[PDB]
Write an enzyme that holds these catalytic residues in place. Structure first.
Site, PDB file in Angstrom:
ATOM      1  CG  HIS A 170      -0.960  -0.622   2.067  1.00 55.23           C
ATOM      2  ND1 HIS A 170      -0.752  -1.515   2.865  1.00 55.23           N
ATOM      3  CD2 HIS A 170      -0.036   0.006   3.602  1.00 55.23           C
ATOM      4  CE1 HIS A 170      -0.561  -2.060   3.811  1.00 55.23           C
ATOM      5  NE2 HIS A 170       0.052  -0.591   4.944  1.00 55.23           N
ATOM      6  CG  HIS A 222       3.674   5.904   5.204  1.00 57.90           C
ATOM      7  ND1 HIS A 222       3.907   4.958   6.352  1.00 57.90           N
ATOM      8  CD2 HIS A 222       3.313   6.124   4.758  1.00 57.90           C
ATOM      9  CE1 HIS A 222       3.005   6.037   7.269  1.00 57.90           C
ATOM     10  NE2 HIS A 222       1.835   6.316   6.659  1.00 57.90           N
ATOM     11  CG  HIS A 275      -0.277   8.448   2.079  1.00 59.79           C
ATOM     12  ND1 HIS A 275      -1.212   7.442   1.942  1.00 59.79           N
ATOM     13  CD2 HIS A 275      -0.122   8.701   3.390  1.00 59.79           C
ATOM     14  CE1 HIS A 275      -1.205   6.657   3.531  1.00 59.79           C
ATOM     15  NE2 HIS A 275      -0.197   7.725   4.088  1.00 59.79           N
TER      16      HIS A 275
HETATM   17 ZN   LIG Z   1       0.774   7.776   6.302  1.00 59.50          ZN
END
Ligand SMILES: [Zn+2]
Length: 255
Positions: A60, A90, A92
């Protein structure tokens, strides 16, 4: 669960009922409604001793993991109580420059969003921390497209090695300090994890000031795969959750 038509965020409540809870994230930051709180202390980021270990493609997103066995990279101060250790970071991102961020400012969407995940050391491990209202602290950073970000190039150059779900690569000696904006001015509110299990254990800290990355940097992100190796290719794009209802909660400003 995933980010597609059949398994997207609009579907997560079926398996994770908390999806329609009272302190869900992300949210839209209405800057005229946000409350300037003079009792908010400056943020305290101690990452000089940070130890990165690896980067992986979990299907993801990609996670850069850190050794959180000692207080090497920590966050304290601000609206926080106690010491929070950096576990992973991380992003997005979107399919286009016009979307990608989770949090929005006056409904404005950024190209991507950087999350640095920290856990409350009073609770002993990450696992115990996700069971507490004050268990996590996520430092959110917006990315806009403009000039290149020297400090992010090392991340960009290794994405080729972890293209598919499950892949991982040794990734040591990476300094997170290279990803921070000049100003530490922030907005803060009580929220949750942005991915299932969406536990309402997060103290969100969204920096006012975005970092700029070059179009070619962001392009490399868009080349990842959701899918595992040997499977039809699903580019890893639009892995962002839509803003949720504030529901009474108040967003405060350190400025
Ligand atoms: Zn996040």
């Amino acid at each position: 669960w995933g980010y597609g038509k059949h398994n997207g965020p609009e579907h997560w409540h079926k398996d994770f009922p908390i999806a329609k809870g009272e302190r869900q994230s992300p949210v839209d930051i209405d800057t005229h409604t946000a409350k300037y709180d003079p009792s908010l202390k400056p943020l305290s980021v101690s990452y000089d001793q940070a130890t990165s270990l690896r980067i992986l493609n979990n299907g993801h997103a990609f996670n850069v993991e850190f050794d959180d066995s000692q207080d090497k990279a920590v966050l304290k101060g601000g609206p926080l109580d106690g010491t929070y250790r950096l576990i992973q970071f991380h992003f997005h991102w979107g399919s286009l420059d016009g979307q990608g961020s989770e949090h929005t400012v006056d409904k404005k969407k950024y190209a991507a969003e950087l999350h640095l995940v920290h856990w409350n050391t009073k609770y002993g491990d990450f696992g115990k921390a996700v069971q507490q209202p004050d268990g996590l602290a996520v430092l959110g950073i917006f990315l806009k497209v403009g000039s290149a970000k020297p400090g992010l190039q090392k991340v960009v150059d290794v994405l080729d090695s972890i293209k598919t779900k499950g892949k991982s690569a040794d990734f040591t000696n990476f300094d997170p300090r290279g990803l921070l904006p000049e100003s530490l001015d922030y907005w803060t509110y009580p929220g949750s994890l942005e991915t299932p299990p969406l536990l309402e254990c997060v103290t969100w800290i969204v920096l006012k000031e975005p970092i700029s990355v070059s179009s070619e940097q962001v392009l490399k992100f868009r080349k990842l795969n959701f899918n595992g190796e040997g499977e039809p290719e699903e580019l890893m794009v639009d892995n962002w959750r839509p803003a949720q209802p504030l529901k009474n909660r108040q967003i405060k400003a350190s400025f």
